[PDB]
Symmetry: D2
């Protein structure tokens, strides 16, 4: 899998489980075309989003539905979602790991790009 | 000032200066309408984006053009930009500070929301 | 003010108020000597820890008592405290801001270093 | 392993490899007693630090030699090291993952405590 997403919960110190994640690919007319989606597992990870054949160079948006996650845990959140926007580049390593660390009023994201 | 943005550079340990910021608001028809824009100062702060009157209830997106910033410094970063999407003024007028901390392959964003 | 500390609360999206902070400096004999201490204000900032004259070259440790803060709020966090260890004034006097962002199981710290 | 450490590099978007990590346990007289140590692998992870038998309740310090890491990559760092200080508690889940994300002038750490 060339594209993995991993989400952690900074309040509970745990993987963020059952978080919905939507990936889009920027179309020629600048609209965001649905590309892949899933929900994080019990390890807070989401594998199998796409394949090497399908994951061509281009601009992608990974949308993490953090609002719904916090709501289901009874906690009031600030953001509608977390958004990660990046260009996939064949010149760089082959596997992209998009990691996100969630708090109610803050989040951080990190790209781990490896061979 | 009901909406402020502060940006830091985690590589240099300094304010991130001349960072372009674009703010949008979700319209009735569900598209992102331009709302306000500006660039961070030598302190890494962006003030005067909008006014109390104009900053009504809505869903706002604050786009911080981190790629433009890093490339202007001769560096090739991972992200196109940092996007911060939030409902604002849903319980009456608040003051929002959107803070961001920038590294070439990583960023974090925080919101400080106060009631004047 | 050559050494400032700013602390935010990532759960509430607010300044972290009344956070105890203890600063130490590594002594000739390699032990941590007490240097300065204080508590963050309603803005989450701690000013006036030390003076230009007293803040000499050295290795400093800024201990932010995050456990005391969370427990005072009726919350059981993971860390005892957040420790920030750095050489200071090695190239002459600088101004340091140590920023921290607090969650119950996580924190981040940033240094902004300026030359007056 | 009840105690794992994982380190990432926010500048290169990669695991932080060959980072020295020292763990200490607080002794009765308040001194820090060496407990375990190692160097992160090519995945930026360090396994096998200790065992369930050895990892008793108490206060621990995980020291991550970030200064040396940045130096070896030709980059000027701010911190002497990153320090993570915490109480190990038998009332909580069994596996502690101490994660750290490194920049020259900033770092974040997160505890992932699971079953």
């Amino acid at each position: 899998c060339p594209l993995m997403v991993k989400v952690l919960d900074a309040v509970r110190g745990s993987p963020a489980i059952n978080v919905a994640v939507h990936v889009f690919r920027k179309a020629a007319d600048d609209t965001w075309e649905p590309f892949a989606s899933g929900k994080t597992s019990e390890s807070g990870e989401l594998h199998g989003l796409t394949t090497e054949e399908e994951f061509v160079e281009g601009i992608y948006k990974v949308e993490i539905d953090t609002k719904s996650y916090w709501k289901a845990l009874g906690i009031s959140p600030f953001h509608e979602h977390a958004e990660v926007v990046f260009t996939a580049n064949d010149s760089g390593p082959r596997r992209y790991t998009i990691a996100a660390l969630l708090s109610p009023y803050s989040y951080s994201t990190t790209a781990v790009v490896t061979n």
